[PDB]
Amino acid sequence: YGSRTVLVYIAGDNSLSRFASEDLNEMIEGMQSVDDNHNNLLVYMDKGSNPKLIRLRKDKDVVVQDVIATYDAQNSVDVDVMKNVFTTAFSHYPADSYGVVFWSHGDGWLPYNNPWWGQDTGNGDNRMNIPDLNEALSVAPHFDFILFDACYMQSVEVVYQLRNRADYFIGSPTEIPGPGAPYEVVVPALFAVNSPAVSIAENYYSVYAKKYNSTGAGISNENWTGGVSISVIKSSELSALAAATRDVLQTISSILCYDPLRENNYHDLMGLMQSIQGNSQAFNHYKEMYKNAVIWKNTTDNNYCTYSSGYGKMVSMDGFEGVSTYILRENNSSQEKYYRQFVEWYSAADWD
């Protein structure tokens, strides 16, 4: 046993494949401040060829990649694949506490029909639906934290759907930079004895905050000057948030949008409630419950966002409260029909 086992799960058989090895090199540098006697950093790495599950171990001042298991080319967002990875990882390395990092593409709660989080383009375009992710997580231990190193995952719908899987969720409600986490300082925070979720957030944010330029001048995949936005949700507080939401309900251009250059699927949850609320008592209580659930947040004044074309620009994060939501537009669309049927948040927060 160790004190903690953290699995970094890299579904990188997709456009992001070029970032994976670099993050691995960062992770290896981060193990220098970590005592591997009690702490297990595991990495499942799929860049397209033959995936591997390793553990990083220190000899002296050198970190060595011990191979736990190797795999044929496989769909890393298939439920039984992820389950097998999980079962193996946490069986070989039990611990007193557990963490996990989901590294891939992401698009919140949105439905995707396989021939959502994570993409594998190895044999067709495969993506994981959040109910499928919740099923895979069911064979896993309960986590102290989940870090989504993936776009748009800090959604109240996603976190509520997965609330029984972890104590804390770390992510961005908007797009996450290509380079993702600075794992040279996030890795020791993954094993912080006190408040790892906050530690992870502070260390993640701080590197991007320091090379931030307001116009994203000189931004590149090798040098991200476009900033970042991050928050931490405490899952044990979501039920009260849902209950506080229902009470508010008993009484769009102006709400901050996290994908303003694309489909406008994502808006700031607090911004939504401020504009819908018809009673200060109900609302001032909602803000308290909101404060209890969203315990950490920070953003640079702008973030870089992209159009569907792939091009992009800096967008103002004015109004940022750290969590996104879907605003029902009543349009009979397929994603709303899915929302009203399979997103628990819809019935939990009483969106009637």
Binding site: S15, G178, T306
Partner: peptide, 4 residues
């Protein structure tokens, strides 16, 4: 430049 890419995002995730």
């Amino acid at each position: 430049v890419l995002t995730x």
